[PDB]
Structures are given as C-alpha cells and as structure tokens.
Amino acid sequence: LDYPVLWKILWGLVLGAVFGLIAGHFGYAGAVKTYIKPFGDLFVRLLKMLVMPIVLASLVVGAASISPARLGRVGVKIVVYYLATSAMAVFFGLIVGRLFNVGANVNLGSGTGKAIEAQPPSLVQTLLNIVPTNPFASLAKGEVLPVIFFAIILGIAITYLMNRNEERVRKSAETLLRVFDGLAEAMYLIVGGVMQYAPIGVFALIAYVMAEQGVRVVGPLAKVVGAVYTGLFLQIVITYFILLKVFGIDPIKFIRKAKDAMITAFVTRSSSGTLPVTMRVAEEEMGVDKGIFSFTLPLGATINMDGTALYQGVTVLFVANAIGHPLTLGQQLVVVLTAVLASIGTAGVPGAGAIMLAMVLQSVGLDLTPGSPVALAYAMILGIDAILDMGRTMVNVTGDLAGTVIVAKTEKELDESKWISH
Amino acid sequence: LDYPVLWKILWGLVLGAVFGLIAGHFGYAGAVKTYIKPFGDLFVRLLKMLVMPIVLASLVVGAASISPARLGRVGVKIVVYYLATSAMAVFFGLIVGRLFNVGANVNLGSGTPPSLVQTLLNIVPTNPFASLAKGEVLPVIFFAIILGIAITYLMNRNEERVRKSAETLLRVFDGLAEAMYLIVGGVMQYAPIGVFALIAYVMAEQGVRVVGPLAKVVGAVYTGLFLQIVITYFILLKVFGIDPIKFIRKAKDAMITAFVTRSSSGTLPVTMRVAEEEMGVDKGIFSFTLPLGATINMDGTALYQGVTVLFVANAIGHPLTLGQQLVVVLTAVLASIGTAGVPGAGAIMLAMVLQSVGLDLTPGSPVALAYAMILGIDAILDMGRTMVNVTGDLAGTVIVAKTEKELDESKWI
Amino acid sequence: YLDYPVLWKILWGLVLGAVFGLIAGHFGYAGAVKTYIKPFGDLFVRLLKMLVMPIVLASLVVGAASISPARLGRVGVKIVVYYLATSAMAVFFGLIVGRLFNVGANVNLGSGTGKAILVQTLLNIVPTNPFASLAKGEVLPVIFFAIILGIAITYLMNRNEERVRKSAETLLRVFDGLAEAMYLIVGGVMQYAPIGVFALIAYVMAEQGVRVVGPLAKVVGAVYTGLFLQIVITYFILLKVFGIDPIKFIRKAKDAMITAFVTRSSSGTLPVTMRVAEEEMGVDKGIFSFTLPLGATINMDGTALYQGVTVLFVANAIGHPLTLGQQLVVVLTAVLASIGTAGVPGAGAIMLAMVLQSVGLDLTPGSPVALAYAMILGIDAILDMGRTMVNVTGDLAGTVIVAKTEKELDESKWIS
C-alpha cells in the first residue's frame, strides 16, 4: 500500500532494533524468529545471488578499461591504505578496550604463554591458492579471490586482443567484452530493485538479532559491547574522516552516500554479501570509476584487517582479565597482530570473529576444555557475537568505501559532479 | 541401416513393449538389461544434458520478450490451472481405486515439524553458478526470469553503450537456445530406438509381476490417466477452444518420451520443442509454464497416491472411509509441490505417507509387506504417472497461451 | 640483477634444475628444495591448470564450428588409427627394452595366488549436466558438448532467418574471443615457464633422483631407452612416411614436451600443447582442438612402456616366471583397463597396483610382491616425467599427421 519516504532503510534499522529489543524483553524472541526473520533471510538471499555475477562481470569490464600498469598502481595504493588503517584499528582496539576495563569479573584460571609449537600461519599455500585451477569451479563454489584473479587476467587479455591488427581478433574480443558489460549492467540494475525491498529486510534482521542477543548486553558484557563500538566510532570518525579530509574529500558527504552500504553491511554481517550494495554505491553514489571499485571493493571484502583488529583487541583483553591471566600492553599487541596476520587470506563471513578468537586462544596455549574458566569467557563473548559481528562488518565496508574513494580521487575519481548540493 | 523414416517413436514404443513382455516371460530380462537396456540409457542421458541450457537460455530470451506484468499474469494462470486439474486428479484417483476395489487381501495390522518457508526461500539461489552446476531447476527459473526482465529494461534505456551491450548478451542466450532446440531435434531422430530400449527393459523386469491383485492396482492407476486426459484435459481444452484430438497427436512425442523416460524435468527439452515446433506456442509462454509445471504439477501424484493408500488400507485391513482417504491423499499432494519429477518419487512418497499416519514398516510386518508389493510394480506406475503430467503440462501451457499469445493457429488447420 | 629473458631458457631451466636437483639432493638438502624452490613450479602448474577448461571448450566450439561434421569424423577415425598404431609400437618396445636391460636384477623370493586371472564408461562420455562437467574438470564430456555446440552453431549460421544467423554469429564470436584470450595468456605464462620448470625438476630430482642408484637404475634406464626409441623410431618414421621433417617437429614440440615432462600431466600441459599446435606446427583449430585433448585422454603410448617394464620388474623380483607371451597378456590387459583416465601425476603406480591385484598376486604388507611394488613406487615421479612427456610428443605427431591429411595445411610455418 506504500511507502512514500525514501530515507527508509535507516528508519527500518531503528524501528527494527527497537521492536526487537521490546519483543525480547517480553519473552517473544521466539516469535520473531518465526514470523519476522525469514523476510530478512530473503533480503539476504537475494544479495547473495548477485555477488558472483556482479563481481566477475564488473571486473572483466573494469580491467578491460583502464590498463594493467595503472591497475598495478591501484593495488599498491589500496594495500598501503589497508596497512595504514589497520595500524589505527589495532591501536584503537587496544586503547578502547583498556578504557572500558572489560575484564570486570569473576573466576580464576591457570596462566600460560605462547606454547604448543608456536607457529605463525603457513601463508604460502594461502597465496598459491589465489590462482584458481578451475575458473568454472571457483565460480560454482563461492570463491571470490580466485574469480578476482581470473577476471583481471581475462580483462587485460581482452584489451590486448582489441588492439591486435586482425579484424576477427578485434570483433570477437569485443563481443565477449560486450557480453560481460551487459551482464554487469543487468546485475547493477537488479540490486537497485533489491534495494527497494531493503528496509523491510533490514528491519527483520536487527529485529531478530536484537530479540535474541539484545537481552544479553546487560552486565560486564555491556562494557565489551560498549568498548567495541566506541572503537568503531573512533576508527570511522577519526582515522577515516581525517584520512578523507587529507585527500580533499568531504567526510560528511561521504557518510550520507555510504549509508546504504553501511546499514546493509551492518545487518548482513557479510562483507562479501554486501558487495552488490557497496559496488552500486561506489558507482551510483560516490561516482567512482568501475576500473577502480570493481577491483578495490571486492579485494577489500577479503583483505581489510580493520574490524578484526578492533574486535580482537577487545575480546583477547576481556578473556585475559576475566580468567585473571595478566597481559601487558605489549603482549596484547603481539597477539592481535598474530590474529590479524592470520585473518588476511579469509574474506568476511558472519561468525568469523568468534571463530578467529577461539583460534588465538588455543594457539596461545589456553585450555578451551569444558567448564574451565577460559572456556567460560569465550562462551560469554560467543553469546553476544551477532551484536559484535554487526559492528565488525560495518566498520570494514565503510573503510572499504573510504579507501576506494581516496584511490579513485588519486586518478579518475573523477566525477565530482556527483558531489554538489543544490 | 539405413532405417530413417518418420513416426517411429510410437512404433518403437509398441514394438519394444512387445519385445520386452515376450523376453521377460521366457526369463531373459537379464540380457535385456545387459545388451539392450544401455541403448535406452543413452536416450535418457542426452536429454538430461540439454535441460539446463534449454531452460536457462529459453527463459532469459522468453522473459526478455513480453513484459513482467504479462509474465505475472501467465504465472497466476498456470498456477490456477495446476490447482484446478489437481482437483480432478484427486477425484479420479479416489474413485478408480474404489471401483477396482484395489486393496483386496490378505494380512493384518493397525493404525490411526512443518516448514514451507525455507522451501519458498530456497527458490532464491545464493549462487546462480552453483545452482546451474547442481541440478536445481526452480532457482534457475528464478534467476533466468530476473535476468530476462532486467535485460529488456536495459534495451529500452536511453544510453547507447548500455543498449547494445544488453542486446549483445540477449543474442548470446538466443543463439544458445536456438542451438539447443536444434540438438533436441537431432536426438529425436534417435528417440524411437531409446524408447524401444526403455520399455523393453521395464516390460522385461517388472512386466511379469503385473499378474494378480497388483494388476487391479495397475488397472486402477491407468484408468485414472485415461480418465484424466480424456475427460478433464479434453473438456478443459474444448472449453477454451482448442481441439483435443490434434493436441494428442502433437504431444505424442513428448508423451511417449515422458512415459518411457519417467522424468518430468528430463522430458523438458522434448516437451518444449514439441511446445514450440509443433503446438506453436511462443517462447515467452512455455519457457516459463513448462519448466515451472515440471515441478509444480500435482496431477499424477494425486492419482498414484489415491490408488495405493487405498490399496494399503485394504490389504492390511485398516479401514479408511472415502473421506479420511481424501485427507491422507491431500496431505501427500501438498508435500509434493516443492519437488520436481524424478523416477523414484511415487514409492518414496508412498513410504513417507505410511510413516506419518503411524503405520509400522519394519520387516516382515504387513504394512511393510503391502508397500513392498507396490514397490515392485513402481516402474510400470511411474511411466503412467509422468506421461499424464507432461500431457497436462502441455495442455495448460497451450490453454494459458491461447488467452494471450498462443497465438499460432496456422499450426493446426 | 637478473634480466633474465634470453628466451631459449625453458631447456636451460630444465638441465640447470635437474643438475641442481641431483647435486642438492646428494647433499641432503631436499627439505629446503621442497620449501623454497618447489612452490615456484607449483605456481607454474597452477596457472596452466586454470586455462585448461576455457582453452579447451572455446577452442573446440570454434574449431567444430569451422570445418564440418563429416570431415571431423574422418580426423576422428584417423587419430584413433594413429593411436593404435603407435601403441603396438610402445608395447613392443616395452617388452624388448625391459628384457634387454633385464630389470629383475635382485634379490627376494615369493609365490602369490596363481598364476591365474566396459559399457558404463562410454555412456559416461555424454555429460548429464554440461555446467557440472565444466566445474568438475571433466575433459571428455566437455569435448562432446563442444562438438555438438560447434556443429549446431554452424548449421544455424546457414539458416535462412537473419536473426538466427546473427545470434549464432554472436555466440560463436564469444567463444572465439574467449579462445583467443586464452591463447594470449598461455603465451604469457610461457614467459615464466623456465623459472617454474627449474623449480619442478629441482624438486623431483632432489627427492627421487637419489633413489635411482642400484637395480632401480636399470628400470629407470630401460623406461627412458624405451621413450627414446618410441620418439626416435616410431614417431619419426611415422612422420616421414606422411612427409614431415622429424627434426623440425622436435624443435617445435620442445615447449610442450618439457612442460609435459615436468608437470607430469598430459591434460594440464594441454594449453601449451594446443598453443604449439597452433602458433608453431601451424595446425588448424578444426583439427587440433579435437585431436589434442582427445589424445590427452586416450593415448596409450606412455603407459605401455611403464607397464611393460614394471610388470617384469615385479615378475622377476618376486620370482614368478613370465613367458614373453604371458607378459604380453598382462600389459594388454593393463592398457585396456587404463583408457578412461587423463594424465595425472601418480597415475603409473596406481595402475600397476591394480594389475598386481587382478592377476591374483597378494599385496599384503611385508610381502615380496608388495616389497617390489614399493621400490617402483619410490622412483615413480622420475618415471612419471618420462611417461607423460612421450605422450604429449606423440599427441603432437598424430595431430600434425592427421592434419597433413586434410588441412594441416600451413607449410609456410616450416621452410628455410
């Protein structure tokens, strides 16, 4: 029968979260899961549908445009960008976590230090596994990063065929490129259609996440949730804003534009499954060239270490203090750095944080055996994980946009007409 | 060689069925399975091959033509039709099982967490490429319709790059679809040999078993088809102004293929080519209605389940009135919607229905002994179950077609 | 401080790697070879694996769209006759070269059980889901679907309706564009090829080269003398008979041969074999896009050598007497049971194991025949290298011979 407002996706967030909270406090969280949540599963399923086609096609079309040496430059830039913001996330994660003093109370356990054969991640085979041995297979499996490799090789090769002298060579290559282009275009059209549904699906998703885990943010857990979020906020408001401003980009204009991707990132808790919304934003909103965002955006849905360095800095310090194990500021740095290195090869998927935490705890030598104190801390964190996941993913997508727009500004943004107010 | 002539497919059927019957009664069915059967396995393998490309390509081209408001309309029509014809199937199955009094004798036993969100939600594919790679027809149908609908909006868009890119893309799908129909055309030159091999086996293996009280079950289920086709499909066709006798003559290839092949979804290339090359239906209709009804069509299930639930009921002595027999069959029919046509489905579903009502299927108990009898004629039954579906799948595709763009009346006059 | 491209490097990367491998191996450093060197060659292998499915699908839709279904059937029957001809030669040489070297040198004793000793595979050529078969990496069904598509596209481009024709050309144009792209990229990888070839033989030599001392030297010795004879006698003589200069052939086949050798996969060398077939032998896409991937599957040459030698090494080590006749019957059986499989590393030991079972020999642990099998298995990589290399070479020789019989045709590629 409706609805007129176009500021709705943000309305659906707030109304949903408030509805979720109330439904949960009154014991009705069970009912949300049944009647409301599946609408958000639909929202989520549809976005999932577009991720392989949009990413594959947009990057064939984008590496075919621009050029391989310029493409190379955009890599070094988006990577230098991610080290910079990663150090800030690490630093803020340590600071924000100490301030709230998250290990408030109360149980005792048995200390340890780095133990059980102390190996950092393999990370050779992680690299060799970028090059897909069957492009068709990597498309059928969800694998983003090999598709990125094959899409870039296909694109660069396509362009080389179009400067070849023979006419058959040039007309065939172009028909091919034309097909990816038409495909990419259809995809972007569709996500716009999906986004018409988005505020209902955004509503259903925090309604559930709030009714389930919203009731749990009481007590000593409030402080970790409280800490992880002032940490996000600091990362955005200081390191992203200051970074945008230094490159001559208005920080407030950016957020009004990034908003759809941010809210979607948040509720969806998947970088890879927000990629369709993010990319359309990079194009229809930020005015970024496909030759840029088709590479940097899906690459950063994997490589961005910001939200893990944030999350990991807080929860390691929470476990450390609940179980009584003294952790100096330095050893926390070396732990978070290990988790961050260890996270790089894997893309953003919901649940990733608790999973990664379990790994750093084990490896550092703690016993995660049942009823143990340290198994009890992890289990507390694990119970607010969706709440934390939402902010982990959202801080990542935001910075994913923020670096895409900076690197773009550095060659062909170029479209400044996209930002003028009237 | 060389044999080529036409209209062999009806010949391969009758001749193979006779070869099979003769071969089975003298006990040589092992040799039929070894030496003859694989030739028919090949006919089935080739048709399976064309199903994903034919369905993907034909619907992207078909939904790119026409328009989404019209597309929605035919959806509603083909759904109303598949409901309507289902009622007739329920009714006839209920009656023929009673008339034949299929359950007869003699052994004794006693008797009397839903979802349907995740089923609907599972229509939307999370990886379109995986869904093409796995079988998954219903999600491909979804992605193909979105893709086509989207392609058309781009071809009406003002920008010049956009418009020619979209049309390039559409042409690739058109070219592919065009190639597929050529190939399925080719396989149909081979079809009567494979139709021959397939009933040759089905007659040689399970044919000798159709003696006795099981014949009454077969008699009842086949009286249901004939009654469904000849009464409710014919009457429905005449009601919308379509000649019932020309229809059968044309569906003939898809029907015989449906019958022998026992896969609704795997007769789909032949059905679609029949739907187009014979019935003269536009791609914009059958590229939706035919593969959708190869999943959603409930007719042959209400027939099969009506006869055998009543057969089990009477064999084990558990009384079910005409009314409570209906309520069981309605349940089995609802549970069938999310699933496409597959050669084991009848017995699998039968087993499930015995379960839910609480009957004990442990060996060697009567309800287990009753089901085990049905399971032994299942192929004879599966052949008629699918043949009636593809027949009705065509009939609604053409009826729904007649109401907008059938439109081609030159194909029959 | 490295240029490096002097561009005759792929044969250099091999010898320097092989020698580096031996030398590094004798000094016990193979552990470091496995870590620091090896992955550079795994990279080389991974890039080529990537290109196989598109290079093959695209090349054959375009190649079967060109030429014509009656001619294609002839090059089919011709390439099959070729592969039978060259196989009998491999069996013959495998029997002779193994006896000549007399591979059963030493020492242990055994009996075993005896003495004494399809359809669904063919049906499995026809893929029930082409999209699945592309993803699962199944060459023969992709080959089948590629030919039917190519043939149908050609018929559609002859159809009277203009739309049908313009669509079909679009479709065909997409595949040609793709194929052309692939060949471009494999051209690029070959720039990297000698570094990766160095790394691979470096590893294979550092690990298994050290084992080739003693009575295993003879089996490695006999198999390579078998390879040398197959190429230098039956490929050459067959090439001359059909009028092709044998020494020019080898210089051209060189990139594919070495890639084959080092990667030990007939099918994952396919991109390099197909590029050679095109940019070097001057063979038409309509010929080689069929014969080469088909021969990466059906070619029995390299198997008859491995099985002719190793069945006899097991035979003589285990003391079980085999007449020249009974050795023949085992190898023929092993070859028949072998066809459906594409080139994969480790394939040799795998097949040997089976013939041992079926003949009734007992492979129980600590057994004599079990002990013999293990020795062969320990030099298997060394044997694999020469096994697949001979196939890829002969794959080319039959591809250009059947090519010579219709449209090779490009004689301009070899002159002055």
- Whether A147 contacts A139, CB under 8 Å: yes
Domain A1-422's class?
A: mainly alpha
Q: From A397, A6, A46, select the one nearest A193 (Cα to Cα).
A: A46
Judged by a CB distance cut-off of 8 A, whether residue B164 touches chain A is: yes
Which residues lie below 8 Å from residue B169, measured CB to CB, with a gap of 6+? A178, A179, A182, A183, A186, B151
Q: How far apart are CA B90 and CA B88, in angstroms?
A: 5
Q: How far apart are CA A80 and CA A93, in angstroms?
A: 20
Best probe of the B interface among A56, A189, A191, by most B CBs < 10 A, is: A189
A-chain CB neighbours of C185 within 8 Å are 153, 157
- Count the Cβ atoms, other than its own, within 10 Å of residue C162: 8
Q: Per-residue DSSP letters for B128-152?
A: HHHHHHS--HHHHHHHHHHHHHHHH
C-chain CB neighbours of A172 within 8 Å are 173-174, 176-177, 180
Judged by a CB distance cut-off of 8 A, whether residue B45 touches chain C is: yes
- Count the Cβ atoms, other than its own, within 10 Å of residue C165: 16
> How many Å lie between the alpha carbon of A130 and the closest alpha carbon of chain C?
10
Which residues lie below 8 Å from residue B125, measured CB to CB, with a gap of 6+? A45, A49, B131, B136, B139, B140, B142, B143
C-chain CB neighbours of B176 within 8 Å are 171
B125: left (phi over 0), alpha (psi -120 to 50) or beta: beta
Structure tokens at C148: 């039917």
Q: From A280, A244, A250, A277, select the one nearest A263 (Cα to Cα).
A: A277
φ and ψ of B159, to 5 deg: -60, 140
Q: Which helix (H) or strand (E) holds A408?
A: helix A385-410
- Whether B245 contacts B385, CB under 8 Å: no
> How many Å lie between the alpha carbon of C51 and the closest alpha carbon of chain B?
19
- Which residue matches tokens 């040997």? C352
Partner residues linked to C409 by β-bridges: C283
Which residues lie below 8 Å from residue A347, measured CB to CB, with a gap of 6+? A144, A145, A271, A272, A301, A302
Q: From B158, B155, B181, B129, select the one nearest B63 (Cα to Cα).
A: B155
B1-413: which CATH topology?
Proton glutamate symport protein (1.10.3860)
Closest alpha carbon within chain B to A135: B129
Structure tokens at A165: 């002298």
Chain B contacts in chain C segment 76-95 (CB below 8 A)? none
Which chains have 3 or more CB–CB distances shorter than 8 Å to chain A? B, C
Structure tokens at C328: 């023949």
Closest alpha carbon within chain A to C62: A172
Q: How far apart are CA C381 and CA B360, in angstroms?
A: 58
Q: From C165, C171, C409, select the one nearest C286 (Cα to Cα).
A: C409
Which residues lie below 8 Å from residue C341, measured CB to CB, with a gap of 6+? C297, C347
**Interface contact B134-C132, CB threshold 8 A:** yes
> How many Å lie between the alpha carbon of B96 and the closest alpha carbon of chain A?
42
**Interface contact B147-A49, CB threshold 8 A:** no
The terminus-to-terminus CA distance of chain B in angstroms comes to 35
Of C50, C134, C135, the CB nearest to A131: C50
Per DSSP, A297 falls in state H
3-state secondary structure at position B91: helix
CA–chain centroid gap for B93, Å, is 17
Q: From C407, C332, C276, select the one nearest C10 (Cα to Cα).
A: C276
Indicate the residue type of A377. Answer: A
Q: Per-residue DSSP letters for B22-56?
A: HHHHTTTHHHIIIIIHHHHHHHHHHHHHHHHHHHH
Q: Per-residue DSSP letters for B198-243?
A: HHHHHHHHHGGG--THHHHHHHHHHHHHHHIIIIIIHHHHHHTT--
Best probe of the C interface among B44, B45, B49, B187, by most C CBs < 10 A, is: B49
Closest alpha carbon within chain B to A194: B146
Closest alpha carbon within chain A to B117: A38
Q: How far apart are CA C103 and CA C214, in angstroms?
A: 11
- Whether A399 contacts A85, CB under 8 Å: yes
Helix axis angle for B322-334 and B68-99, nearest 10°, is 140
**Interface contact B172-C167, CB threshold 8 A:** yes
CA–chain centroid gap for B139, Å, is 18
Chain C contacts in chain A segment 106-135 (CB below 8 A)? 124, 128, 131-135
- Whether A124 contacts C37, CB under 8 Å: no
Indicate the residue type of C373. Answer: Y
CA A267-A268-A270 angle, to 5 degrees, is 140
**Interface contact C50-A173, CB threshold 8 A:** no
Per DSSP, B158 falls in state S
Structurally, at CATH architecture level, domain C1-416 sits in Orthogonal Bundle (1.10)
Judged by a CB distance cut-off of 8 A, whether residue A173 touches chain C is: yes
> How many Å lie between the alpha carbon of B347 and the closest alpha carbon of chain A?
33
- Whether C385 contacts C226, CB under 8 Å: no
Q: How far apart are CA A23 and CA A10, in angstroms?
A: 20
> Helices in A164-289 by DSSP H: which ranges?
167-213, 220-234, 241-246, 251-268, 271-280
φ and ψ of B239, to 5 deg: -55, -35
Q: From B146, B132, B164, B187, select the one nearest B60 (Cα to Cα).
A: B146
**Per-residue burial over C108-140, b = 16 or more CB atoms within 10 Å of its CB, e = otherwise:** eebebeeeeeeeeeeeeebbbbbbbbbbbbbbb
Three-state SS string over chain C comes to CCCCCCCCHHHHHHHHHHHHHHHHHHCCCHHHHHHHHHHHHHHHHHHHHHHHHHHHHHHHHHHHHCCCHHHHHHHHHHHHHHHHHHHHHHHHHHHHHHHHHCCCCCCCCCCCCCCCCCCHHHHCCCCCCHHHHHHCCCHHHHHHHHHHHHHHHHHHHCCCCHHHHHHHHHHHHHHHHHHHHHHHHHHHHHHHHHHHHHHHHHHHHHHHHHHCCCHHHHHHHHHHHHHHHHHHHHHHHHHHHCCCCHHHHHHHHHHHHHHHHHHCCCCCCHHHHHHHHHHCCCECHHHHHHHHHHHHHHCCHHHHHHHHHHHHHHHHHCCCCCCHHHHHHHHHHHHHCCCCCCCCCCHHHHHHHHHHHHCCCCCCCCCHHHHHHHHHHHCHHHHHHHHHHHHHHHHHHHHHHHHHHCCCECCCCCCC
Structure tokens at C274: 């197909």
Per DSSP, B281 falls in state B
Partner residues linked to B407 by β-bridges: B281
Q: How far apart are CA C234 and CA C393, in angstroms?
A: 12
Judged by a CB distance cut-off of 8 A, whether residue A137 touches chain C is: yes
What burial class does residue B316 get, using C-beta atoms within 10 Å of its C-beta: 0-12 exposed, 13-18 middle, 19+ buried? buried
Closest alpha carbon within chain C to B135: C129
- Whether B272 contacts B279, CB under 8 Å: no
Q: Which helix (H) or strand (E) holds B87?
A: helix B68-99
Q: Which helix (H) or strand (E) holds A73?
A: helix A68-100
Closest alpha carbon within chain A to C172: A172
Judged by a CB distance cut-off of 8 A, whether residue B280 touches chain C is: no
Which residues lie below 8 Å from residue B87, measured CB to CB, with a gap of 6+? none
- Whether C112 contacts C369, CB under 8 Å: yes
- Whether B131 contacts B143, CB under 8 Å: yes
Partner residues linked to C283 by β-bridges: C409
**Extents of the domains making up chain B:** 1-413
Indicate the residue type of A418. Answer: K
CA–chain centroid gap for A272, Å, is 7
A-chain CB neighbours of B153 within 8 Å are 189
3-state secondary structure at position B407: strand
Of A52, A185, A189, the CB nearest to B127: A52
Q: From C320, C333, C313, C309, select the one nearest C361 (Cα to Cα).
A: C320
CA–chain centroid gap for B220, Å, is 19
Of B118, B126, B150, the CB nearest to A190: B150
- Whether A185 contacts B166, CB under 8 Å: yes
Of C135, C173, C181, the CB nearest to A158: C181
Structure tokens at B112: 């009397």
- Whether C54 contacts C281, CB under 8 Å: no
Q: How far apart are CA C10 and CA C251, in angstroms?
A: 12
Q: How far apart are CA B220 and CA B384, in angstroms?
A: 11
Of C119, C135, C148, the CB nearest to B38: C119
B-chain CB neighbours of C156 within 8 Å are 175, 178-179, 182
Which chains have 3 or more CB–CB distances shorter than 8 Å to chain B? A, C
Q: How far apart are CA A81 and CA A175, in angstroms?
A: 36
What burial class does residue B175 get, using C-beta atoms within 10 Å of its C-beta: 0-12 exposed, 13-18 middle, 19+ buried? buried
Which chains have 3 or more CB–CB distances shorter than 8 Å to chain C? A, B
A287: left (phi over 0), alpha (psi -120 to 50) or beta: left
Q: How far apart are CA B16 and CA B34, in angstroms?
A: 16
CA A287-A293-A297 angle, to 5 degrees, is 130
> How many Å lie between the alpha carbon of B169 and the closest alpha carbon of chain C?
9
Three-state SS string over A372-397 comes to CHHHHHHHHHHHCHHHHHHHHHHHHH
